[PDB]
Structure 1
Amino acid sequence: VKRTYQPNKRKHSKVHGFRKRMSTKNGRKVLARRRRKGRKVLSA
Structure 2
Amino acid sequence: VKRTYQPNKRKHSKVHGFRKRMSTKNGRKVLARRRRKGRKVLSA
Question: Is TM more than 0.5 here?
Answer: yes
Specify the alignment match of 1:3 in structure 2. Answer: 3
Gaps of 5+ in 2: none
RMSD: 0.7
The number of equivalent residue pairs is: 44
1 or 2 for the larger relative contact order (CA 8 Å, sep ≥6)? 1
| Displaced runs of 4 or more, over 3 A | none
Q: Could you say which structure has the higher helix fraction?
A: 2
TM-score where L is the length of structure 1: 0.90
Q: Which runs of 5+ in 1 are unaligned?
A: none
State the alpha-carbon separation in 2 of the partners of residues 6 and 38 from structure 1.
29
